[PDB]
Amino acid sequence: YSKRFAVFLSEVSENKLRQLNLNNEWTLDKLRQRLTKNAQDKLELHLFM
C-alpha cells in the first residue's frame, strides 16, 4: 500500500501519464489526416498550443 502511494507520487510517472494521454489521443490516423501540404509534407503543431 505504501508502494502504491509513492509510485503515484512520482513526477516521471504522471509525466508519462499526460504524455500517454497525448499518445492515445493523438493517433496515427490523426497525422494521416495531417500529412501533405503546400510545398511539401508538412506537419502542424503550428498554432495548436
Added chain:
Amino acid sequence: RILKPWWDVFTDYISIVMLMIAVFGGTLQVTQDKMICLPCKWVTGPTGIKYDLDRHQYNYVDAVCYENRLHWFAKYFPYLVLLHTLIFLACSNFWFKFPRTSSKLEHFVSILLKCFDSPWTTRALSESETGVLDKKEGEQAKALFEKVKKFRTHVEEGDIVYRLYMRQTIIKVIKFILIICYTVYYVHNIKFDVDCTVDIESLTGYRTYRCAHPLATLFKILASFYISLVIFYGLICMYTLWWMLRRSLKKYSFESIREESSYSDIPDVKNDFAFMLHLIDQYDPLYSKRFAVFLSEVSENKLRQLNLNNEWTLDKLRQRLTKNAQDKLELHLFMLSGIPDTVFDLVELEVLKLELIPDVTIPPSIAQLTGLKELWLYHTAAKIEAPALAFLRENLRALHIKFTDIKEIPLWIYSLKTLEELHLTGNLSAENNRYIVIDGLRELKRLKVLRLKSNLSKLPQVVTDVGVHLQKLSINNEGTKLIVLNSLKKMANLTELELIRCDLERIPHSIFSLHNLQEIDLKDNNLKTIEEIISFQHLHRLTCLKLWYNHIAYIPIQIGNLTNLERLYLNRNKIEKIPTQLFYCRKLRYLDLSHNNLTFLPADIGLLQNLQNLAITANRIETLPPELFQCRKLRALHLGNNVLQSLPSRVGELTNLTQIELRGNRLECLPVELGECPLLKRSGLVVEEDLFNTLPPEVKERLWRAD
C-alpha cells in the same frame, strides 16, 4: 450533522456516562437498599444483650425510620441525576432539532457536502490557461451556484442560530451552577449511621433507634464522582463561553474569507453567515477554503464561460456561416458573455461581427482562422493582452468600432500595421477627447479608407491629414460647419469624399487640387446654386456626382462640361427645369431625376446613348418624348409617381429593357406594344390586374410562359 465541535462531543460522552451512573444507582437503590434499626436503650464476662422484640417489629421500625427520619436527597439521588441529565440531553438535542434553524442547517450541509464534492473546484482551485471539461458538472455547478445564492437569500447573516445557540449555552451554564450549589450543600447530609427517634413507643416501647444505612458510603463515593464529572463537564462549557466572548463575532470569519482570499489569489469574495462558518472554522479551515473558492464570482464567471465554450456547437455556427458578401458571423446584437472556442475551429469565416460582448480578451488560437480579415468589434472592450496581436498584425485589414465611447477604445489593439479601413462611428469627442484618440493610429501607415461617422465633430483632427495613404474619407453625421482648408488638399490621394448629413451651405473651394477625386458624396446639405464646374473641370477624374438631398432649384449651364461623368444623382432637391446641356455628358449611364418637380423631357435625352437606367419617379411628367428609342442601352425604365398616360411602340425598340416602373399614373391604355418584349419580364410597379387582364398571349404567354 458532523459539524459539531469537540466540546459537544465531550458533552455527548460525559452525558451517556452520567445517565449510566443514574441507571446504576436507580437499579441498586431499588433492589438492595434497606435500613437496619435497633433501639438505643440506656440513653461469663461478656454476654449478649437481649431485646423482647420481634422480626415483625424490626421490619416495622425499619419502614418507619426509613420513610421518616432519612434525607430525601439520599432517597432520590438517582432520580435527580436521571431527570437532571435528561435536561442536558434536551439542551443539545433540542437545540439541534429546533425546526426552522434545523432546516437552515440541513440545507446548509447539503450545499456544503456538494461544495466539498465538486471536482471543478478541485480544478479551479488547482489553478492565460486552457482546459476543456465535460457537460453536466457545468450544470451541477450552475444550479449548485444558484442554490448557493438561494442560501444567500434565505439567511442574510441570520441571528436565530447565534441567539438560539447563545440561549441554550447560557441556560446550560446557569443550570450547572445551580445544581453544583445544592448538591455540594447536600453531600454531607448523606450519613452512614443515623439516629432515629419516632412515635412508636406505644407499639414497640422504645424512643430512640440507632439505625445503620448500609449503602450511604456507595452513594457518597459515586455522588462525589458525579459532581466531579459535572464540574469537568460545565467547566468545558465555560470554555465555550470564553471563546464566545473572547474571539467570536458576526463577520470575523468573513475577514478570514477575504484575508484568506487575498492570501488565496482570488481576492473579491462575498459572504454568508459567519458563526455557523466559525464552527466549521473550528472543524477545519480547509473546508472553509473549499467554500470561499467556490463562492467567488470570477471563478463561476470562468465556469459559465466554459459552459458557453462547450454549449456553442459546430452545427450552430455552421448554420450561421454565409452572409451578405462573404462568410460573416454574428455575436452581433446577441449579448453573449463570451466568445465560443469553436469559433476558431472553422476557418471558413471571413468577417466577424461582435456587437455586445464583455470579452476583454480573445484566445491566442484565433489565428487558426486564416480567412478572417474583416472584424466588427462594436459595443465591446476587447483589450486582449496576448501575443495574438502579432498574429493579427499580419492578418487583417478592416476594423469596426461603432457606438464606442471615449474610454472604451482599446488602445494596444491599434498597433497592427496591416489595417486598411477603419470605422469610427460614435466618437463623441471634444478637443480634449480628440487627443484620447491617441496618435498611435499614425503608425498604421496602410490606412486607406477612414470612417469618422456619427459623432459630434465640427473640425477634423490635425492628426487626420498626416495620412496621405488615405483614399476614401467620410466625416459624416456631424454638426459640420468649418473645414480647415490645408488639411483637405494635403491628402491628395483622396479619390472619394463623403459629406453625409453636414451643415454645408456651400462647398470648400480648395476641392480643385484633389485631382485623384472620382466620387463625391454630398447627401443632406443646404445647397442652393453651386460652385462652378470650372472647379470641377479641374477635377479631371470626376465620374461620380452625388447630389442627394439639397434644396438647389436650378442647375447652371456648365453641366455640359463633365464628359467623364457617368453617374448623376439629382435626388430630392427643388429642380424644376431640365438644363439642355445634359446631352454633352454622353458617358452618362445613370440619370437620377427623382424627387423633383419635372414637366417634360427635352431632346437631350436621345443623345445619351450610354444611358442604361433612368429614374424619373416623384415628378409631374405626363407624356414621354419619342426620344425613348435612342436610349437603346436602357434596362430600367424607372417611370414612377407621375401623371403619365401611355406608351408608344418605342417600348419594343429596347432590346435590354428588363424592368418598367409606373408608380401612380393614368396607365389607362395598357398598350399592346409591351408584347414585343424581347428580354423584359418585370414591369415592376406597373403590375396590376388591369395590365394582367389586357394582352392575354403577350403578357400571359410571353411573361407567364417566360416565368
